[PDB]
Amino acid sequence: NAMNALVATNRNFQRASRILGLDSKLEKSLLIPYREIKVECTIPKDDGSLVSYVGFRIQHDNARGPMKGGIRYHPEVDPDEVNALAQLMTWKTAVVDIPYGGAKGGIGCNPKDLSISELERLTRVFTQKIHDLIGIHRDVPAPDMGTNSQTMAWILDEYSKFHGHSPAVVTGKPIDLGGSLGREAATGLGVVFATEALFAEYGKSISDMTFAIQGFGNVGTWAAKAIFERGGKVVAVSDINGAISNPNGIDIAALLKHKAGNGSLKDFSGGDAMNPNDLLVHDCDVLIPCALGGVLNKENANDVKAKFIIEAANHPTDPDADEILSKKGVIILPDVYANAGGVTVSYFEWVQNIQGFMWDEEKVNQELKRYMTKAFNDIKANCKTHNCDLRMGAFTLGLNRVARATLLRGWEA
Amino acid sequence: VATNRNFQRASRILGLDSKLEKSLLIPYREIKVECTIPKDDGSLVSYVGFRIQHDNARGPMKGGIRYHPEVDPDEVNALAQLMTWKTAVVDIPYGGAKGGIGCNPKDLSISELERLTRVFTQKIHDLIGIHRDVPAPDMGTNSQTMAWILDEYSKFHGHSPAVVTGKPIDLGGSLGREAATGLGVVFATEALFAEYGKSISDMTFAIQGFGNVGTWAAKAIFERGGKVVAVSDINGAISNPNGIDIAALLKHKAGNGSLKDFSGGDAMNPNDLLVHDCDVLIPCALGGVLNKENANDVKAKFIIEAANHPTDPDADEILSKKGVIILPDVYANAGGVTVSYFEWVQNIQGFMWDEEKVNQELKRYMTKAFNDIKANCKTHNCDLRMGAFTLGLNRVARATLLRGWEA
Amino acid sequence: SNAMNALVATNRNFQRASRILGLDSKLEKSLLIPYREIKVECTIPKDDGSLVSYVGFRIQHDNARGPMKGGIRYHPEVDPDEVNALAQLMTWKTAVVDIPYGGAKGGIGCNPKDLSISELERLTRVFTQKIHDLIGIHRDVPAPDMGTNSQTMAWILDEYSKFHGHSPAVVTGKPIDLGGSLGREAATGLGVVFATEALFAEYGKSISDMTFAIQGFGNVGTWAAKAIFERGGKVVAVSDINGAISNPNGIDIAALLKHKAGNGSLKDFSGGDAMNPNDLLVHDCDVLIPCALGGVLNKENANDVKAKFIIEAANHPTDPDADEILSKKGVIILPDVYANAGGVTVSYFEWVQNIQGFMWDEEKVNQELKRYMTKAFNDIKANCKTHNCDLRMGAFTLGLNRVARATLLRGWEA
Numbered sequence A: 001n002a003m004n005a006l007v008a009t010n011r012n013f014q015r016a017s018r019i020l021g022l023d024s025k026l027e028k029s030l031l032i033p034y035r036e037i038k039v040e041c042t043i044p045k046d047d048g049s050l051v052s053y054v055g056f057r058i059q060h061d062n063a064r065g066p067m068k069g070g071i072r073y074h075p076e077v078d079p080d081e082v083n084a085l086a087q088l089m090t091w092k093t094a095v096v097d098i099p100y101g102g103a104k105g106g107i108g109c110n111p112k113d114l115s116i117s118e119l120e121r122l123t124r125v126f127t128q129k130i131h132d133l134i135g136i137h138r139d140v141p142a143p144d145m146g147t148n149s150q151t152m153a154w155i156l157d158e159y160s161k162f163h164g165h166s167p168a169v170v171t172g173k174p175i176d177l178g179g180s181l182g183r184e185a186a187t188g189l190g191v192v193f194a195t196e197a198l199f200a201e202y203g204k205s206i207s208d209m210t211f212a213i214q215g216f217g218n219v220g221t222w223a224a225k226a227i228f229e230r231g232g233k234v235v236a237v238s239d240i241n242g243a244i245s246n247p248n249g250i251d252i253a254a255l256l257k258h259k260a261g262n263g264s265l266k267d268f269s270g271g272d273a274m275n276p277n278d279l280l281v282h283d284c285d286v287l288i289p290c291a292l293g294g295v296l297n298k299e300n301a302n303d304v305k306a307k308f309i310i311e312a313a314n315h316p317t318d319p320d321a322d323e324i325l326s327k328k329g330v331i332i333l334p335d336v337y338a339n340a341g342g343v344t345v346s347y348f349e350w351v352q353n354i355q356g357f358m359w360d361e362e363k364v365n366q367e368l369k370r371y372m373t374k375a376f377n378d379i380k381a382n383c384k385t386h387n388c389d390l391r392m393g394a395f396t397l398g399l400n401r402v403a404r405a406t407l408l409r410g411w412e413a
Numbered sequence B: 001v002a003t004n005r006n007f008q009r010a011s012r013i014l015g016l017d018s019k020l021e022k023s024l025l026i027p028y029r030e031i032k033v034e035c036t037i038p039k040d041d042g043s044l045v046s047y048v049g050f051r052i053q054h055d056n057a058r059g060p061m062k063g064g065i066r067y068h069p070e071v072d073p074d075e076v077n078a079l080a081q082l083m084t085w086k087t088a089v090v091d092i093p094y095g096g097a098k099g100g101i102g103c104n105p106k107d108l109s110i111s112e113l114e115r116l117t118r119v120f121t122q123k124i125h126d127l128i129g130i131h132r133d134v135p136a137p138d139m140g141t142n143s144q145t146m147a148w149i150l151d152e153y154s155k156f157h158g159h160s161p162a163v164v165t166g167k168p169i170d171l172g173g174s175l176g177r178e179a180a181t182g183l184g185v186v187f188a189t190e191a192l193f194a195e196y197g198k199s200i201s202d203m204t205f206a207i208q209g210f211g212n213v214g215t216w217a218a219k220a221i222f223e224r225g226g227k228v229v230a231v232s233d234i235n236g237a238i239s240n241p242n243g244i245d246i247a248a249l250l251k252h253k254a255g256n257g258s259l260k261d262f263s264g265g266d267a268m269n270p271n272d273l274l275v276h277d278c279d280v281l282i283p284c285a286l287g288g289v290l291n292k293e294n295a296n297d298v299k300a301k302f303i304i305e306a307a308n309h310p311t312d313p314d315a316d317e318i319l320s321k322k323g324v325i326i327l328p329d330v331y332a333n334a335g336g337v338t339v340s341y342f343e344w345v346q347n348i349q350g351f352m353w354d355e356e357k358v359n360q361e362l363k364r365y366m367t368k369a370f371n372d373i374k375a376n377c378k379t380h381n382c383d384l385r386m387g388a389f390t391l392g393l394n395r396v397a398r399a400t401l402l403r404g405w406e407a
Numbered sequence C: 001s002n003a004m005n006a007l008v009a010t011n012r013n014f015q016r017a018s019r020i021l022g023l024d025s026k027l028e029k030s031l032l033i034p035y036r037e038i039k040v041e042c043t044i045p046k047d048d049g050s051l052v053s054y055v056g057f058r059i060q061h062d063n064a065r066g067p068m069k070g071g072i073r074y075h076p077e078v079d080p081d082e083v084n085a086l087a088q089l090m091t092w093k094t095a096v097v098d099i100p101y102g103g104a105k106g107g108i109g110c111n112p113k114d115l116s117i118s119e120l121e122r123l124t125r126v127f128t129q130k131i132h133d134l135i136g137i138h139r140d141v142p143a144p145d146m147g148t149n150s151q152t153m154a155w156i157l158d159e160y161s162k163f164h165g166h167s168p169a170v171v172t173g174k175p176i177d178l179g180g181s182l183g184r185e186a187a188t189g190l191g192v193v194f195a196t197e198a199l200f201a202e203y204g205k206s207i208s209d210m211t212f213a214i215q216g217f218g219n220v221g222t223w224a225a226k227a228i229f230e231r232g233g234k235v236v237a238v239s240d241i242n243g244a245i246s247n248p249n250g251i252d253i254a255a256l257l258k259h260k261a262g263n264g265s266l267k268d269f270s271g272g273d274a275m276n277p278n279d280l281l282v283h284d285c286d287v288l289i290p291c292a293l294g295g296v297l298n299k300e301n302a303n304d305v306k307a308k309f310i311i312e313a314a315n316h317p318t319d320p321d322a323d324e325i326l327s328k329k330g331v332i333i334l335p336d337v338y339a340n341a342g343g344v345t346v347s348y349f350e351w352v353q354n355i356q357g358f359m360w361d362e363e364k365v366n367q368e369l370k371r372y373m374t375k376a377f378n379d380i381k382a383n384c385k386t387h388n389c390d391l392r393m394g395a396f397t398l399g400l401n402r403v404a405r406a407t408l409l410r411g412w413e414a
């Protein structure tokens, strides 16, 4: 089904390089990651027996600043996937013009199969094995699929044994350990700010549309909530265990309460249970993938009903699907812009930490809006001077900014 | 003895479990180091310096350095633990510490005190730090002491202005530092009063003590229209039922005048201050002044504890029965430690604030802290003293639990 | 060896200010000795593979008030006494405007015009390798100077960061795309105007009240002239050392700016009258602003100056004989150590923005610049009253006393 994640991302990178006319030698430098790290992570389970994993940290580019990107605990984590995600962070940070490069990490494990004490030990061992490589001004992790603010607390705590109290070494922290107000909701809310900027160009409002949402974690819950509050009609939601639909709109606040009491989507009373395999091809105006990458591919792209796709997940649409969907008249707001709210507020968390003084939530949200608005305006102008679609307008915008910084730094030893 | 019972009560109010409680009572780290220097005449003297680092779950530790003899370890430990709670009460990102040198600084020359300070810094240079443990002045030490610690520490770790607070302005100290505690008392009083719908401008005040805290609090009250009807210090007292002209009074103190010889009031017995007719009583000078003998004769309906522990538990109950509200010391006099945080912030950001910004941030922190204390009081159905204690204790507990325990 | 304009001015001024303050002679001796002097071998392969060896250097004069600060000159004339004097002057200058730095000065004895861009980059990176442990965000923060520029700073940043991690604050003057500050090009000229505004307020006058003659039309002259023009000042004469134009109605500085943009020269400009650039300093005006050159006011022309105010934007336009004649004529001289400090003040702001991890917009940079410059004038004015002295000594006594106080508070025991 899914195209190789790194093959897909490199095809977009090649398409973007051609638009900019990049010299092949500069292009090759920008493609190769700065550093790839794979480390053994062996822990005792709660009964004392050993389990061994491999942890990864791919540091793709640091021309524009310390590297930035989250840590995924998921059974399909592998070098290709982490490499593709890391490269995308390099472009995304540059799209929103925050002073970071790109990185990504992960462990190939299933968190549902580990106890909370095992997850803590695994997280601390991973931190021990990379403590030299990450750092406030080197590489700053954060959550991603299968990790959360408690995971980041353990990274902070273990890292600080080696280098002293270092709040800014990781973002997505709990509020009570130096996290930023607004960070938990930031990706989902930024999706909404990105969607509003796009709909403004077409003269539409969120309240005009129906929505289908794949995935219901940190990104999908906050995105659905924010859409729901602004009058959007959310007609289907899936997660790994099932899905729920309602053509008149799901009461998202009620669905989230039901979820917080350990209810499953399929059992929610204000909707009809559905097969999650039918989510991406469900009738809707706007489709928002909020789970795995590569899920829109040559096999299902012709059956997409949506007129808009908002890429909240990282690389949910492969290049085969891009072209099919373009010919169906579908507009795709690309991941490196639409889901950048998270890393943007991560930047603000990091700033607050190094300034030793936290901001109020209204300032975090004012700055998020300003960053997301400016990035969209830059993409629009870039699509014009280069006469390209939104994915390429954002991709070339970030790639060109990375090239500039790379060229200023130079190459002598 | 009463301190351990009090911590247990606060712990049980919060529902902490015994294992967490035991951990919170054990200090993170205790250090003692030999400090030997040549005297001015070349002969040696040897002292022991120490630092009790109580807790660092919420950030770098913070606390004073005392140059004073007759060191009592139990009392040093108690004060380090108190700083852990106090920093959490006003929500500044520090834990608690206390240190010192067992010496009598009156017996040392200024060059001997400098050498002793530098040697002590040499002996603890890897255990203090901008993000590790940030000392401050205390009994027997001052901003000059801090300057020497900074200078010697920076030889080891590079220029590190935020390694200590209380610095001279000329070496990175903060504007507003001298007035911080007295002014913070007043911002705290304004927050308390607004909760009852009252304003400083409609209250009368009696103030015990006219030193660093009492002078600045009186000034700030006077400038907000408060009527200061009585003031005492160690040598005398002065009363005026229509309000003392505090600007005039501060001028008279500067010229080495006495409170009793001030013309803008009537001299009074300083032993009569706490029982003076007023709306608001502010003990600023001494602890242990309100006890079972005099608490029934207090006439104020609000007591603002600027001094540390002015009120014993007998008095607390007596005054509660009389419907008196007591703003507790741990919060009310926290403006000094709060501005010390701002000093550290300004240092780390490399860019100092003007005095207006320091004072606005101080008012902001003191106001939010009051509202957090009051909300906690509603949650646990307790008075302000216990509400403040449980707020601080719970914040430390929460950070500790989030950090976790696996190696 | 011991004789350039900046050496004589600084040690004359240091000595005079030290006596006004009554500084102890042992403290004075310590303040004159630099903290540390560094010379390092810098050998590189040229593009053709052959070696060349230069000597790089950094004089670190004083750090009582903070990390040291100062430029890196790539220039073949290296005069050790002049380098020391300039590092010392930065110590006083930073103190005058109350920025938390001491002074330094460094460079490489080379002619950068003989080197390719790749050679300059290797030379810069090797120099950085040789001094990486002696500079740093909280130790010593270089900046551009004669023969170096923002590209030079990018290379220092990049190489230094190999040894210590990303360290944007290790140098100022960076490209905007690598953490440089907005407002840098205008900073010195705009600061001159902020300083002039403060001075004139003391007389209850405004720039719109005055006529101006400006010597120099480079980075400082253009921006000062632009900012004066926009505030209603009448710029009646401008010289660029090669030509000069006079207009008693006021020159249209906007028109003159566009003309310089069209690669025209001052003598080419049609919106005024031909004048001899050597007559600029004695031109009729209320305010004279020497921007381009030093030593130009001397005992032979001081008495023909017509201005009531002299704003020393350039470094050291006024020699000792002229300074005396002009004071006796009643002329008020805003001294260079203060008046042109806008550049170093905004370099302080760049370091702050880097340390804070978040860049300011240009409006904020310029509000902060005006605040720093205004407060420094008021402090200088206070010191003039305390010591009954002219503005130049009010400034030097202010900066010297701030360094002395910080030194005495830090103390002397080991």
Ligand SMILES: NC(=O)c1ccc[n+]([C@@H]2O[C@H](COP(=O)([O-])OP(=O)(O)OC[C@H]3O[C@@H](n4cnc5c(N)ncnc54)[C@H](O)[C@@H]3O)[C@@H](O)[C@H]2O)c1
Pocket: A143, A144, A145, A146, A147, A187, A214, A215, A216, A217, A218, A219, A220, A238, A239, A240, A241, A276, A290, A291, A292, A293, A312, A313, A314, A339, A340, A342, A343
């Ligand atoms: N967390 C952030 O700040 C952030 C920022 C930008 C983008 N992203 C991206 O958003 C996506 C989701 O991240 P998250 O933080 O929400 O993760 P999460 O672990 O919080 O939740 C992931 C969600 O996806 C669901 N899911 C997993 N496999 C699925 C499948 N096969 N079908 C349907 N649903 C499935 C899970 O059940 C869960 O509801 C990822 O691509 C991530 O990289 C995350």
Ligand SMILES: NC(=O)c1ccc[n+]([C@@H]2O[C@H](COP(=O)([O-])OP(=O)(O)OC[C@H]3O[C@@H](n4cnc5c(N)ncnc54)[C@H](O)[C@@H]3O)[C@@H](O)[C@H]2O)c1
Pocket: B181, B208, B209, B210, B211, B212, B213, B214, B232, B233, B234, B235, B270, B284, B285, B286, B287, B306, B307, B308, B309, B333, B336
């Ligand atoms: N930042 C701070 O100064 C700070 C911080 C926390 C707590 N406190 C509390 O405030 C108290 C006062 O601190 P300070 O800096 O104002 O001290 P200070 O030495 O500057 O002034 C003390 C004042 O108390 C008076 N006094 C002493 N004994 C008295 C007595 N028996 N009756 C009446 N007046 C008497 C003195 O004459 C003087 O007026 C401390 O002892 C402590 O309890 C101070």
Ligand SMILES: [Ca+2]
Pocket: A029, A030, A031, A032, A033, A034, A060, A061
């Ligand atoms: Ca690369």
Ligand SMILES: [Ca+2]
Pocket: B034
């Ligand atoms: Ca011994």
Ligand SMILES: [Ca+2]
Pocket: C030, C031, C032, C033, C034, C035, C061, C062
């Ligand atoms: Ca010296």
Ligand code: NA
Pocket: B039, B040, B041, B042
């Ligand atoms: Na001696």
Ligand code: NA
Pocket: C046, C047, C048, C049
């Ligand atoms: Na070559």
